[model samples]
Target: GSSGSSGQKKDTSNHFHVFVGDLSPEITTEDIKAAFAPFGRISDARVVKDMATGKSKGYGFVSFFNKWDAENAIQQMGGQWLGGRQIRTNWATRKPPAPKSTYESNTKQSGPSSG
Candidate 1:
């Protein structure tokens, strides 16, 4: 005899990503992968880095194939100590940055004006 799915629909909410913050600059992508590995299979894990300095930006992203694992990681690891820093974990919510001005307006109008 095999157990089947319950009357409720299958849960797919766990198939999502999470954002991690307040990380130590010394932490590496592998460290993050290790931390969340126990919870579930990680689709991807990476730490944001500065382009010029190539240093950790104190944050990272973790993608999980199982939403249940993501939820567990968030609940168990959020605000928990890792890499000697208090880590903050939450659902990833990436938003586009504000647009920049096409031209600078601070420059003076220079030259004479036609009357």
Candidate 2:
């Protein structure tokens, strides 16, 4: 979450990621769309969920089409109250875990049973 090193850090310019929190359990995709409607061209938005329970995880993502747009939204709406909860916005990273290696299954343990 910290944007840079303690010193000699480049101040983060016009870029941030939006974290929509305290979302109602019944909140739907449409609710998110409406909430961020005031902001310019939205690049993406989605409410996370628990896989097994089909329940909202109470957090979500909102991406603007550009750095400037994202910055503007954060400036105007960040920490603002929405639905009785404050919204948090900051820079986002979208790296996903890489796939398993092909040699994974080949390294199986072959030790005999210890009696």
Candidate 3:
């Protein structure tokens, strides 16, 4: 590795976001938005749900217009308890969506044996 390789790969920064955790079981999408709106101008917020069982994931994410707002939620709401338990908020995380190639991977290429 060369010295220039220090930051060869930069992180895909998901900015102006705050991921809330330990959400209350009864918390709704509107509740998440309302809870986060007081700090700043919220772009949008949603509750993460369990797609399989059609249940709540007990977590949600908040998006704001500025970094200050997102960070504000993390601090002001860090120790702030919600319906049943204390909520944890931090920078949102994202996993890249699967590339188009993955879906067509089933079209395997089988080569002739050179032997």
Ranking by lDDT: 1, 3, 2
Q: What's model 2's lDDT at 56?
A: 89
lDDT of 3 by residue, 3-110 (tens): 643223334243477889898888988888888888877656788999999778988988776688888889899889888688988878647796566344666887
**Local lDDT at 104 for model 1:** 69
Error of 2 at 20 (Å): 2.7
Question: Per-residue CA lDDT of candidate 2, range 1-115, in tens?
Answer: 9595332524333334566666767777677777777775554678899999988898777766456766676677666766666666554565689887664466678888887
Q: Kindly report which residue stretches of model 1 are placed more than 4 angstroms away from their true locations once superposed.
A: 1-14, 94-115
Superior candidate under lDDT, 2 versus 3: 3
The residue-by-residue lDDT of candidate 1 on 1-115, one tens digit each, is 7986322435434357899999888889999999899988876689999899988888998988767998999999997888988999988965788877687669777777777
Point out where model 2 deviates above 4 Å: 1-17, 94-115
lDDT values, one for every candidate: 0.83, 0.67, 0.78
In candidate 1, position 67 carries an lDDT of: 77
TM-score list, all predictions: 0.66, 0.56, 0.65
Q: Candidate 1 clashing pairs?
A: 14-67
Per-structure clash totals for the candidates: 1, 1, 0
Q: Is candidate 1 or candidate 2 better by TM-score?
A: 1
Q: Whole-model lDDT, candidate 3?
A: 0.78
Model 2 RMSD in Å is: 15.1
